[PDB]
UniProtKB/Swiss-Prot annotation, chain A:
Belongs to the NTC complex (or PRP19-associated complex), composed of at least CEF1, CLF1, ISY1, NTC20, SNT309, SYF1, SYF2, and PRP19. This is Pre-mRNA-splicing factor SNT309. Keywords: mRNA processing, mRNA splicing, Nucleus, Spliceosome. Present with 721 molecules/cell in log phase SD medium. Involved in pre-mRNA splicing by stabilizing the NTC (or PRP19-associated complex). As a component of the NTC complex, associates to the spliceosome to mediate conformational rearrangement or to stabilize the structure of the spliceosome after U4 snRNA dissociation, which leads to spliceosome maturation. Disulfide bonds: none annotated. The keyword Calcium does not apply. The chain holds residues 118 to 175 of 175 of the full protein.
UniProtKB/Swiss-Prot annotation, chain B:
It comes from Saccharomyces cerevisiae (strain ATCC 204508 / S288c) (Baker's yeast). The lineage of its organism: Eukaryota, Fungi, Dikarya, Ascomycota, Saccharomycotina. Present with 784 molecules/cell in log phase SD medium. This is Pre-mRNA-splicing factor CEF1. Involved in pre-mRNA splicing and cell cycle control. Required for the binding of the NTC complex (or PRP19-associated complex) components to the spliceosome to mediate conformational rearrangement or to stabilize the structure of the spliceosome after U4 snRNA dissociation, which leads to spliceosome maturation. Its absence leads to an arrest of the cell cycle, possibly due to the inefficient splicing of TUB1. Belongs to the NTC complex (or PRP19-associated complex), composed of at least CEF1, CLF1, ISY1, NTC20, SNT309, SYF1, SYF2, and PRP19.
Length: 58, 49
């Protein structure tokens, strides 16, 4: 019965190690998403500016 | 005679063991079920990792 408790705890340690590295990968992705999403926002604003600018010139 | 003598001893040895060991069986068997869930989560986390 004691052996089975040593066997069990080992599995749940790996559950945490996987849990941490899985959340750690997603954590890095998050920053990337927010980096570019801003850059795309910057692009679209500039896009709309030209769109009306070119009209108001003509 | 043997069947009588032996199986009476067996039933006494069994029920004496069972009283002590059915509790320890449940202890040991409910722990085994924990491996079967500790494993099944392990794979989904590895897969998702």
């Amino acid at each position: 019965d004691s052996y089975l408790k040593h066997q069990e705890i080992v599995l749940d340690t790996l559950l945490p190690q996987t849990v941490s590295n899985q959340w750690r990968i997603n954590n890095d992705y998050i920053r990337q998403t927010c980096t570019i999403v801003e850059e795309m926002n910057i692009q679209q604003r500039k896009q709309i500016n030209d769109l009306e600018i070119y009209r108001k010139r003509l | 005679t043997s069947m009588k003598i032996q199986f009476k001893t067996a039933m006494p040895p069994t029920e004496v063991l069972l009283e002590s060991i059915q509790s320890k069986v449940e202890s040991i068997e409910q722990l085994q079920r924990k491996l079967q869930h500790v494993q099944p989560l392990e794979q989904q986390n590895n897969e998702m990792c």
